[PDB]
Amino acid sequence: SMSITRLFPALLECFGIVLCGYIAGRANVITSTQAKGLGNFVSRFALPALLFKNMVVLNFSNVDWSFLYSILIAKASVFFIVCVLTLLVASPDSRFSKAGLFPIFATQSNDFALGYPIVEALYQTTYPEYLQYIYLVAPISLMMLNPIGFIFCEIQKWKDTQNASQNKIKIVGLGLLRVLQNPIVFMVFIGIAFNFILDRKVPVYVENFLDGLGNSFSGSALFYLGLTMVGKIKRLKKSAFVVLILLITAKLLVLPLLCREMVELLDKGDSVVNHTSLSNYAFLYGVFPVAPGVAIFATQFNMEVEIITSGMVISTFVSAPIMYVSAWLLTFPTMDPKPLAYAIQNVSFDISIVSLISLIWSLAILLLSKKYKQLPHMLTTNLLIAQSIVCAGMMIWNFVKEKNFVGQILVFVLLYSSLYSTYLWTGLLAISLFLLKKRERVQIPVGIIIISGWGIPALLVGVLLITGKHNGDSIDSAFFYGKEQMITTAVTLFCSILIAGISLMCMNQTDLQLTRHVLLCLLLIIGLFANLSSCLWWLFNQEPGRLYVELQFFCAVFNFGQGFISFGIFGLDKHLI
Amino acid sequence: SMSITRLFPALLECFGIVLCGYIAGRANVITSTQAKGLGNFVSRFALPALLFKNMVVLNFSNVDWSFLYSILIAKASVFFIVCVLTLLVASPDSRFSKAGLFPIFATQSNDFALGYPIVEALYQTTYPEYLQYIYLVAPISLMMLNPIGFIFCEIQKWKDTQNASQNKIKIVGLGLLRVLQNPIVFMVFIGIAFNFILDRKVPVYVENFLDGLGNSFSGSALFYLGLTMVGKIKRLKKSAFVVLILLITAKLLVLPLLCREMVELLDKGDSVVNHTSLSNYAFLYGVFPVAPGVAIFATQFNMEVEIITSGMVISTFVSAPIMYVSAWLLTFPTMDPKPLAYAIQNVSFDISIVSLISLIWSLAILLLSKKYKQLPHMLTTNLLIAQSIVCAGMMIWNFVKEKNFVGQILVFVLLYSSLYSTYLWTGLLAISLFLLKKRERVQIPVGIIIISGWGIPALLVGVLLITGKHNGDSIDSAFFYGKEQMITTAVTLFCSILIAGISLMCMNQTDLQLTRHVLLCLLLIIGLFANLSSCLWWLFNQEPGRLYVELQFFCAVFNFGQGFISFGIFGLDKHLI
Ligand SMILES: CCCCCCCC/C=C/CCCCCCCC(=O)O[C@@H](COC(=O)CCCCCCCCCCCCCCC)COP(=O)([O-])OCC[N+](C)(C)C
Ligand SMILES: CCCCCCCC/C=C/CCCCCCCC(=O)O[C@@H](COC(=O)CCCCCCCCCCCCCCC)COP(=O)([O-])OCC[N+](C)(C)C
Ligand SMILES: CCCCCCCC/C=C\CCCCCCCC(=O)O[C@@H](COC(=O)CCCCCCCCCCCCCCC)COP(=O)([O-])OCC[N+](C)(C)C
Ligand SMILES: CCCCCCCC/C=C\CCCCCCCC(=O)O[C@@H](COC(=O)CCCCCCCCCCCCCCC)COP(=O)([O-])OCC[N+](C)(C)C
Ligand SMILES: CC(C)CCC[C@@H](C)[C@H]1CC[C@H]2[C@@H]3CC=C4C[C@@H](O)CC[C@]4(C)[C@H]3CC[C@]12C
Ligand SMILES: CC(C)CCC[C@@H](C)[C@H]1CC[C@H]2[C@@H]3CC=C4C[C@@H](O)CC[C@]4(C)[C@H]3CC[C@]12C
Ligand SMILES: *[C@@H]1O[C@H](CO)[C@@H](O)[C@H](O)[C@H]1NC(C)=O
Ligand SMILES: *[C@@H]1O[C@H](CO)[C@@H](O)[C@H](O)[C@H]1NC(C)=O
C-alpha cells in the first residue's frame, strides 16, 4: 500500500537541507545579498527546467481527473472560508490586504521543494503514477486561486491613492497578469503545449540538459528556503499571535481533512485498495507547509509582510512532525495488531533520534552561554537533561525489548524516572513563573526545588517497583508492570497538570524572558492532558480499539519528542557563547 | 566499447548550463556579490556531500591501481616540465609565483563538474567501474601536486616581504596546511575513513540527505562557473597572449598524450579491449579543462591573477570541441568504414547544429548593433551569412542523403558555393585589413568586393557542374562529382590561403577593432591549410588509410563549425543594441 518505512529518511533530507541553509544563514557564511543570487538561480533556471521536463513526459491519458478536481475543490473550500471570515472580523482600514493574502497563505503548499521528495519516497515503488499529481495540482491551484487574492490586495492599493472609479478592468487584469508572470504558470503552459508537439518525449539533445538543470532544483530550493528563514520571526502582539495560530491551523489541519472528505465524496469508483490509497495520498497532500512565495508576494505588495513571513517560517517547522505523525496514523488500520507494536516502536525510535540531537544543541547553548545561573533558567536546564535521558532510553529500549529481564528492569526504571521527572518539572517551572510575577523576593530554594523534582519521581518509581508485578513481555515500554505502572503515570500527570495549570492562570491574573518561558509551559500542558486521558482510557476501558491505538501513538510522540518542541522554542535563540 | 553516440548530449548539458550561467551573469540578473552566495553554497555544501557519498560507497578492491598511478605519473610529468621551463624562461623578479601557479594551471582539471557527466555518459552502460576514477584522481592529484606550488608562491611572498632566513618549515607547512584546508581533501579523508568504519554502506537515515545534497552539485556548479566567467578575459599583450597559448596548449594537448603513453607503458596486462578502453578513458580524462579553483588560488595569493583567470575562461571555452573531436577520433579505429561514414555525418550534423545556433546569435548581434556599416564588418556579415548557409546545407544533406538526385545536386551546389565563399571571404577580409592598415583613403568598393566573393565561387560551382560527372552515391558530401570536385576545392583553398597569407604578413610589416579582426583571419588560415592538404592527399594518393580518415574528419569539423570559432571571437562582445 504505502512504503511508510522510507518516509523518515525523506523528512530527514527535506529538513536537513533546510537546517543547513538556516545554519549557513545565521553563521554569516551567506548574507542576505548573497542569498539573493542563490534564489535567482533556483527561481529562474532550476524550477522552470524542472516543470518543463516533468510536463513534457506527463501522460494525460493516465491521470485520474476525479482526484485532481477533488483536491482543488478542497483547496477552494479552504480559500472560501478564510476569505469570508477575514472580511467579517478584520478592521475596515486593512480588510482587503488580509482577505487577499491570508487565503493565499492557507492554501498554497510547498509542493515542489518539500512535497515532491516526500511523495516520491512514499509512492515510487508502490503507486508510481501518484508522483505526477504534484506537478498537476500546484500550478492549476496557482492559476485558479491566486488571481482572486490579487484583486483584493490591489483594491487595498487603490485605497491609498483614493481617486477615480478604480476602472474595474484595470485592477482584475493586473492580478491575472501578476499570476501569469510567475515562472511556474507559463512553463506549465509551455509544457502542456510541447507535450502534444513533441509527442510526450523529450528530445535527446535536450534531455540531459533538462535533467541537469532539473535535478539541481531539489537541494538548492530547500537550502534557499533555509536561508530565507534567518531572523524573520520578529515579535508579534496577541492579536497577531492569535491570527497566526488560526492561519497555520487552517493550512496544516483543516485543508488535509477537507481533502479526504472531498476525495471520498467526488472520486467515486475504483477498487477498495486504490480508493484507500487515494484517500491516504489526499491527506498527505494538505499537510505540506506554506510555500515561501507567499512571503515574496506580501513583500512586493508591501502589505502584511510581517504576519505572512512569520507564518511561512513557522509553518515549515511545524509541518515537519505533522507529516510524520499523520502518515503513520493512516497506515495503522492497514496493519495487523501484532506488528503494529513494532510500528509504534519504530516511530518512537525515529523521533528520539531527532529529539536527542536537538536537545544536545539546546543543552550546549544553555550551558555555554552561562544563562543557567539565571533564576528562570535553572529549572529549564534540569528539564532538558531529563528529556535527553528519555530519548536515549528509547534508543536502548528498542534493542533490548526481548533481552534479559534484569537489563529490561534497569532500562524501564531509568526511562520512567526521566518521564515522571519531565511531568513534574513542567509544574516546577510554572511555580517559578508565579514566584517571579508576584510576591517579590523571598524566593524558594532552587536546591529544594531540584530535590523535589528529582526525588518525587524516584519515590514513585520505587513504589511501582515495590508494589508492581514481574514479567511484562511486551514490545512497548508502557506495558511492563501492568495496571500499577499506568496508575503511577496517571497520578503523576494529574498532579503536575493541576499544579502547573493553577500557576499559569495565576500568572496572567497577577534577560528575564517571561514572554517565551510561558509558551514552553503551555505546549507541554496539552501534552500532559493527552497523556492523562490515555491512562484514564486504559483503566476504565480494558479494550483497545477505535482510538486507543491512536492515543497510544500520540503518547509515544509527546514522550520521546518533547525535546524537539523545547529546542524549537529555546534552542533557536541569539546568545554570546 | 564506448557509447560515443551519447557524448554530445552530455557536452550539451555541461556547456548549456555554463552558457546559462554566463547569460545570467551578463544580463545583470545575478551580480558579482549575489554570485558569491551561490558559490558559497556549492563549495561548502554540495561538493563535500558529493565527495563524502561517492567515497563512502567506493570499492577499493575493484580499483585498478595501475591506471591510477599512470594518470598521476602523467600529471606529475606535465607539472615537472611546466615548472622547469617556467623556472628557466621567466624573469627573476616573479619567477616563483609563475613557477608555482602555472603548473597547477596546467595540471588541475575541472573533472568534477564537467568531467563526471561526460565520463558518466561515455561509460555508464559499458564499463560502469570507470566512474570512480574521477573521484580517485582529482583529490590525490590535489594532495600530491598543489603543495609544491604553494611552497613556490609562499617563497614569492617571502621575497616580497624580504626578511629573515625564510624559515623553511614555516613555509612548507603553510603550503601543506593550505592544501589541507581545501574542502575536497579532508572530505576525501573522511570518506576513506568512513568506508572502513561503515563497511562501504551509507546509513539509511543519511543516504537520502547525501543524495539530495550531492545531486545538486552538477547544475549549480556549472552555473557558478558560468557566473565566474563574466568579463574576466581582459586584455593582454603579446607576451601574455603567447604564455596563455602555451599554458592552454599544455593543459589540453600534451597532458592527454602523456596520459595515453604512460597508461600503455605502465598499465600492462589485461585483455586487449580492456587496454584500449583504458587508453581511451585516459585520453578523455586528460582533455578536461582547468578548474576555476586555480583562479581562486591566484586571487587569494594576489599574483598572476589576470593570466590564470584568462587561462581558465579560455581553456573552459576551448575544451568544449576538443573532447568531442578527440573522443570521436578514438572510436574510429574500432569502427568499420561503412558506418564510419555515418559517424562522420553524425559529427558534422551535431557540429552544424551548434555552429548554426551560435551563428544566428552572432548575426543578430552584428545586425542589431548597426556595426555592419563599418569598414571591416561588411565582409564579416557576408562571411557569417555564408557559414550559416553551410551549416543549414549540412543539415539538409544529412537528411536528404538518400533522396532524389536533383535535390542532392541542388544541395551539393548550394553547400559548395557557400563553402567556397567562406574560403575566399577570409582572403577578402585579409585584403580589407591590408587596405585599412596602409595606403590611406582610396579604398576599394565594397560592392565590387561582394561581387567578387559571390561570383567567383558561383563560377567555380558552375564549372564543376559543367565539367563534372553524374552519380556520386556516397553518404559524405565531399564525394559527389569525383576528382573534379576535389580539384575545385583545392584550387579555391590554395588561392585564398596565399592571398590572405600575403595580406596578413604585409599588415604586420606595415571602434575599428583591428586587434581582434586579425585573429579570426588567423584561426581560419590553419583551417585552410588543413583543408588544402586533404585535397592534396586524395589526388596524389588514392588509398584511404592511416590518416586520411582523420584528415577527412578534421575537414568535416572545420567546414561545419567555423561559425562556432567566429562566434567565440566576435559574438561575445559588448554593444549597445
Ligand atoms: C519530528 C520527527 C519526525 C520528522 C522528521 C523531522 C526532521 C528533523 C529536522 C528538523 C529541522 C527543522 C527544519 C527548520 C529549520 C529550523 C529553523 C527554524 O525553523 O527557524 C525559524 C524558527 O522557527 C520557529 O520558531 C518554529 C516554531 C515552532 C516551534 C514549536 C514546534 C512545535 C511543533 C508541534 C507540532 C505538532 C506535533 C505533532 C502533532 C500531530 C526561524 O528562525 P529565526 O527567524 O532566526 O527565529 C529564531 C530566533 N528568534 C526566536 C530569537 C527570533
Ligand atoms: C563544438 C560542438 C561539439 C561540442 C558541444 C559544445 C556544446 C555547445 C556549447 C557552447 C557554449 C560554450 C561554453 C562557454 C560559455 C560561452 C561564454 C564564454 O566562454 O565567454 C568567455 C569568452 O571566451 C572566450 O574568449 C573564448 C576563447 C576561445 C574562442 C575561440 C575558440 C576556438 C576553438 C578551437 C579549438 C580547437 C578545435 C578542435 C580541434 C581538435 C567569457 O567572456 P568575457 O569574459 O565577457 O570575455 C569576452 C568579452 N570581451 C572579449 C569583450 C572581453
Ligand atoms: C540523523 C538525524 C539528524 C536530525 C537533525 C535535525 C534535528 C536537529 C536540529 C537541530 C540541531 C542543530 C541546530 C542548529 C541551529 C542553530 C544555529 C545557529 O543559531 O547558528 C550558530 C552558528 O552556527 C553554528 O555554530 C553551527 C554549529 C555546527 C553545526 C551543528 C548542527 C548539527 C546538526 C545536526 C547534525 C547531527 C548529526 C546527524 C548525523 C548523525 C550560532 O551563531 P550566532 O551567534 O547566532 O551568529 C553567529 C555569529 N556571527 C554572525 C557574528 C558570525
Ligand atoms: C541544441 C544545441 C544547442 C547548442 C547551444 C550552445 C551553443 C550556442 C552558443 C551561443 C548562443 C547565444 C549565447 C549568448 C551569450 C551572450 C549573452 C550576452 O552577452 O548577454 C546579452 C544579454 O542576454 C541576452 O539578451 C540573452 C539572449 C537570450 C538567451 C540566449 C538565447 C539562445 C541560447 C541558445 C538557444 C539554443 C536552443 C536549443 C534548443 C532548440 C547582451 O547583453 P549586453 O547588453 O551585451 O551586456 C549586458 C549589459 N546590460 C545588463 C546592461 C544589458
Ligand atoms: C494540530 C495541528 C494539526 C495543526 C498545527 C497547529 C499548532 C501545532 C501550531 C500552529 C500555530 C503554531 C504556533 C504559532 C506561533 C508560534 C510562535 C513561535 O515563536 C513559537 C511557536 C508558536 C507558539 C507555534 C507553535 C505551534 C502551533 C501552535
Ligand atoms: C590543439 C589543441 C589540442 C590545443 C588547444 C590549443 C588552441 C586550440 C587554443 C589554445 C590557446 C587558445 C587561444 C588563447 C587566447 C585567445 C584569446 C581570446 O580572446 C580569443 C581566443 C584565443 C585566440 C584562443 C583560441 C584557441 C587557442 C589557440
Ligand atoms: C488501481 O487501478 C485499477 C483499478 O481498477 C486496478 O488495477 C487496481 O485496483 C489498482 N492497480 C494498480 C496497478 O495500482
Ligand atoms: C575487463 O576485465 C577482464 C579482463 O581479464 C575481462 O572480463 C574483460 O576483458 C573485461 N571485462 C569487463 C566486464 O569489462
Swiss-Prot record, chains A, B:
It is a multi-pass membrane protein. Residues 25-44, 91-98, 154-178, 230-238, 302-311, 368-379, 425-445 are cytoplasmic. Changing residue 537 to R: Abolishes the effect of cholestrol depletion in mTORC1 activity. Its main location: membrane. It is found in: Lysosome membrane. Residues 1-335 are annotated as: PIN-like transporter. Residues 345-576 are annotated as: GPCR. GO terms for molecular function: cholesterol binding. GO terms for biological process: cellular response to amino acid starvation; cellular response to cholesterol; cognition; intracellular signal transduction; negative regulation of BMP signaling pathway; positive regulation of TORC1 signaling; transmembrane transport. Residues 66-69, 120-132, 200-208, 260-280, 333-346, 401-403, 467-485, 541-550 are lumenal. Cholesterol binds at residues 8, 22, 231-233, 516. Glycans are attached at residues 274, 346. The keyword Transcription does not apply. Cholesterol-binding protein that acts as a regulator of mTORC1 signaling pathway. Acts as a sensor of cholesterol to signal cholesterol sufficiency to mTORC1: in presence of cholesterol, binds cholesterol, leading to disruption of the interaction between the GATOR1 and KICSTOR complexes and promotion of mTORC1 signaling. Upon cholesterol starvation, GPR155/LYCHOS is unable to perturb the association between GATOR1 and KICSTOR, leading to mTORC1 signaling inhibition. Binds indole-3-acetic acid and may play a role in tryptophan metabolism. Cholesterol binds at the interface between the PIN-like transporter region and the GPCR domain; these two regions likely coordinate to sense cholesterol and regulate mTORC1 activation. Homodimer; via the transporter region and DEP domain. Interacts with the GATOR1 complex and prevents interaction between GATOR1 and KICSTOR; this interaction is disrupted upon cholesterol starvation. This is Lysosomal cholesterol signaling protein. The gene is GPR155. The chain holds residues 36 to 718 of 870 of the full protein.
